Amino acid sequence: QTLSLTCSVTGDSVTSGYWSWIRQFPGNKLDYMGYISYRGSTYYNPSLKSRISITRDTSKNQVYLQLKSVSSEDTATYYCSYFDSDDYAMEYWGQGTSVTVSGGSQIVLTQSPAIMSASPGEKVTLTCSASSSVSSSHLYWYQQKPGSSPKLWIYSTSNLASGVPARFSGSGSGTSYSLTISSMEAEDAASYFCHQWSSFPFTFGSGTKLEIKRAPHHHHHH
Amino acid sequence: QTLSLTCSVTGDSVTSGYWSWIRQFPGNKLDYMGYISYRGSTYYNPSLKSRISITRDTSKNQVYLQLKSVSSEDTATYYCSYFDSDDYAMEYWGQGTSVTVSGGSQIVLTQSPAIMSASPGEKVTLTCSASSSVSSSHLYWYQQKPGSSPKLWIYSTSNLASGVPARFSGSGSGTSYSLTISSMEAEDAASYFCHQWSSFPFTFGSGTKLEIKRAPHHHHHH
Amino acid sequence: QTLSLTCSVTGDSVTSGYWSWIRQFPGNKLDYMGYISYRGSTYYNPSLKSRISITRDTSKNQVYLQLKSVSSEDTATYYCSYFDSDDYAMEYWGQGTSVTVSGGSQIVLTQSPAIMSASPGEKVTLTCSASSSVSSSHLYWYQQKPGSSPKLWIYSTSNLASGVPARFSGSGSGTSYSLTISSMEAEDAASYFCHQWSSFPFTFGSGTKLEIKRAPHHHHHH
Ligand code: NI
């Protein structure tokens, strides 16, 4: 029983780049499966390799993911991301197709805490601990709102994607990195995953779910 | 005026299976349109048949839905689900394309209540009443969070999709089935639809919207 | 460095219509890029024209968006909408593919306020001010819930898409238009954008984010 999914984020055009498949398990732990480059070369995450096969068909203009010998373990939502660059670097993510099946070492990134509780205007600080050293220009932060696919929020440790509101910043180097918000705003109620792609295989943090309380209220009418 | 939508969840590969179109009306009442099998055979829901036409093109690797003679009544969001099995059973849903048009018997599943209000840690119990007897291994439960497409939560009455947190269980047989949560968790704030596919045509419940209160608070500072 | 995206909302079938690309910037300001018609003719928004190129391939059954000379400014989420009509008028939107890049006159519609705070059952009233006169049958209202793509809520100023709950209405003419809800309902917690397509180039309002308070509570146990 094989899993076969299609991807088609990019159009015609396109002269290079890297299509990568990524799955998110329930629990939200993100997993980097592998990629296929324009000139045909692929990379599969060792955790599989024997099972996974990424391919493409410029004839149909579709990129495929074949995950042989599936089992309830592969139940997750699958994303297909496209990545290109010179100095300018483009990154777009597909929608996530949710898959459910029935039959019942690297740089590990440690997100903490698993769920930060914040009221509005409050200063917020999230930490990501890398099980080893990671190039500071290959450390990324993604924001994900329930139902949406990951949005590149901060790239190269401290650089804010265009449009990220000023209240955000990104600190770090070597094994300890962090993201902070000068002061909540409820539009920041999401999940933040740190990402590292300097060491193969590429990894993601477990997640911090960020959500704000309501703020105080009183009843001295009174 | 015809409605023409495409689907492409599966990739190359694939040696069988059943692509099925399903629409969700505003109100969230889900509707099972029909399916097309790999070896070419189709099934259309009687409510239409004269209007609907499902087809595929392995050349473009796309599955199509043609719904002739549309009218404001067909305004809904359309999903394309793929279903395969031996003993292992794969099921993945497309994204939902939202359609809006302007011009102004079976086993009916009864969800109840239409909207359960729960605080955290509370025991929760949702009921689904079938207008007739339904095979207990063809009764399914789907969870849908606003904006997302249905996620297979429980299959065969009481079996939890991999990753469904332990606090969930599924009771039932014959005409009365139910789903319960040992104790809320706000991540359970979604909609739960029961599904039956033992009797043609296949049907879905109306929906229960599940959402939690906040929990108590006090002000004895004091 | 060019941006190349694909679209495939429509299926085979289809005898005309207009595929249009629209981007939404972080901040949510919506932007109308252009369209391509079935018989091949295109229209590009003047803000670009030199950069944008819309095309299609009936061979692959895909519609493309090529946005040459990208820069962090084009970071947004891109939608592909399909529009057809005789008297019956079909409109469906794609999913939004989120794009992020790194390198650091018309009828302007003014949404107000940028964020209305409402408790349940309350009468709500949102206003849209057009920098000039707009045909009242080319003024539209879209609802967007975080993570979802715009849903056509009201068309031709005052006509409710099928399924829009009765509590909604749409007032206006000439330069001032408005949308109202007879009484909240928390399922109305979304964003509402007014849209005008009588004058080229077509425009969208900035957005009003609509969200309800909780309602009062007391503690006289007591
Ligand atoms: Ni109180």
Numbering used by the authors:
A (entry chain H), B (entry chain H), C (entry chain H): 16 to 237
Provide the authors' own sentences about this structure as they appear in the paper.
A single chain antibody fragment (scFv6H4) was made from a high affinity antibody that is one-sixth the size of the parent IgG and was shown to rapidly decrease METH serum concentrations within a minute of intravenous administration in rats. The present study was undertaken to extend our understanding of this therapeutic scFv by solving the structures of the empty site anti-METH scFv6H4, as well as in complex with two important active metabolites of METH, amphetamine and p-OH-METH.
The most conspicuous difference between the crystal structures of the apo form and the METH bound form is that the apo exists as a homo-trimer in the crystal lattice while the latter exists as a monomer. The Ni2+ atom sits on the crystallographic 3-fold axis and two histidine residues (His 110 and His 112) from each of the three molecules related by the 3-fold symmetry coordinate with Ni2+ to form an octahedral coordination. The overall structure of the apo form is similar to the METH bound form, but there are significant changes in the CDR loops, most significantly in the CDR H3 loop. These large shifts are due to its conformational transition into a β-hairpin in the apo structure. The apo form crystallized with a Ni2+ ion sitting on a crystallographic three fold axis and the His-tag residues from three symmetry molecules cluster around it and form an octahedral coordination.
